[PDB]
A paper describes a structure:
Here, we address each of these questions in a study of diffuse scattering from crystalline isocyanide hydratase (ICH). Upon formation of the catalytic thioimidate intermediate, this helix becomes more mobile and permits water to enter the active site and complete the reaction.
Engineered mutations at residue 150 (e.g., [name], G150T) also favor shifted conformations of the helix to varying degrees. The refined WT and [name] ICH models are also highly similar (∼0.05–0.07 Å Cα RMSD). In addition, the six WT and [name] datasets show ∼2σ difference (mFo − DFc) electron density features around the mobile helix that indicate a minor population (<10% occupancy) of the shifted helix conformation. The CCCross for WT-1, for example, can be calculated as the average CC of CC(WT-1, [name]-1), CC(WT-1, [name]-2), and CC(WT-1, [name]-3). We find that the CCCross is ≥0.83 for every WT and [name] dataset, and each data pair within the set of replicate WT and [name] datasets also has CC ≥ 0.8, as shown in orange-colored cells in Table S5. In general, the CCLLM values are higher and σ values are lower for the Refmac5 anisotropic ADP models compared to those refined in PHENIX. By using LLM models that incorporate different anisotropic ADP models for the same structural model, we found that diffuse scattering data can discriminate between more and less plausible representations of anisotropic atomic motion, even when these models have similar Rfree/Rwork and CCBragg values and thus cannot be distinguished easily based on Bragg data alone.
Author numbering:
A (entry chain B): -1 to 227
B (entry chain A): 1 to 227
The structure:
């Protein structure tokens, strides 16, 4: 309807698609919501896995949003230095009811200046990059600070979206959606956190990310310098 | 030599049934993932999210794994002879025949659950028995080379289970850590056993019309298998 809650996800090249599609299916289950997928122009955008998604609106045509949500992925590094994307995020955040992200999407919020003095989380492997952007880093799965909600790595988007559902509506509605999604997880292994995974697995995860971390650290410090000037 | 994994992408799919497993499995080495429909091109999910099929039935390579997601659109598939014949064609040699949520009802309509242990979404579980399955109330059920997952989000648990079977435990653990899949749901309402009674009543009330329509489709599909 024309009174629908307006929810917008930034959809960018090399996004981690589950960061977006998990929350999307949770939030699209709520009453009278309209969901936008936003990029520089409508059309196909290819996720890091090769899955093709479709942006529904441009920055210029996007209506004022009640919720803005930034997913993460390999493509965040480019977004952290994209003045057009950062300007759009800041404009929408001025009036959004909730300003949100999943995984390394919080680094984009940081580059936009929206984490200064705020508690936030991100993917476990990139958590150290929050502090240079002014955030108070919190090692929890879903972190709230006022109208800022941030989720941790990839699959945390589902827990994040159920938390957001309860704030937009109420606990009963969020529970109904949880039941419809049969979200009673039973992972076959206990390796979802660096604290519980086998040490051998964590060490490989850290080394496989080392080059990306060093590159993102330099981008992060450039973005921080632009906030300081 | 790459492992060929195919998902059936159909109109009115529940997209998370597909996109959850897709991001898990596409993270593995030496795999190629296909999104299959009658023709390549856009296919709109039940939420309005637009996905893109990458291959037609005819161009799909022989699959190591076939996976049927669920959603509103399964009712049509259960009486679509082309889709059912394609599924049987690929199941004949696939190493694994699989589904998530109400995708197992499509496997049932194709005749592939006869005498097998299987699960589905909690609200439609009663429809497995008329399709010949032995219904099991577990989140991921394996019977030989058949793996079925329960409702929607069970696809993530299903996909990690499958990853370990295709490769090994260490490979599945690496992917689990990259996905930071250590869930901490904000409520305990993911199962009819644990949700408040008021929430269960509302969820059942909302599913009632779909369940009735699917009771009727299921009995026609079963009668075809019998005749």
């Amino acid at each position: 309807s024309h009174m629908a809650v307006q929810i917008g996800f930034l959809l960018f090249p090399e996004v981690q698609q589950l960061d977006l599609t998990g929350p999307h299916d949770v939030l699209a289950s709520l009453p009278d919501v309209q969901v936008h997928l936003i990029w520089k122009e409508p059309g196909p955008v290819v996720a890091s896995s090769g899955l093709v998604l479709q942006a529904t609106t441009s920055f210029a045509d996007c209506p004022p949003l009640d919720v803005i949500c930034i997913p993460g992925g390999t493509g965040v590094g480019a977004l952290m230095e994209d003045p057009q994307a950062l300007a759009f995020i800041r404009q929408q955040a001025a009036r959004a009811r909730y300003v949100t992200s999943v995984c390394t999407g919080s680094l984009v919020l940081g580059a936009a200046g929206l984490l200064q003095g705020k508690r936030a989380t991100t993917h476990w492997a990139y958590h150290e990059l929050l502090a240079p952007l002014g955030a108070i880093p919190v090692h929890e799965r879903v972190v709230r600070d006022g109208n800022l909600l941030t989720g941790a790595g990839i699959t945390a988007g589902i827990d994040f979206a159920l938390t957001l559902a309860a704030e937009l509506f109420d606990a009963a509605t969020a529970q109904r959606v949880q039941l419809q999604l049969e979200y009673a997880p039973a992972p076959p292994f206990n390796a979802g956190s660096p604290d519980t995974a086998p040490a051998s697995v964590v060490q490989q995860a850290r080394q496989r990310a080392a080059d990306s971390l060093h590159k993102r650290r330099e981008i992060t410090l450039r973005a921080a310098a632009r906030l300081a000037a």
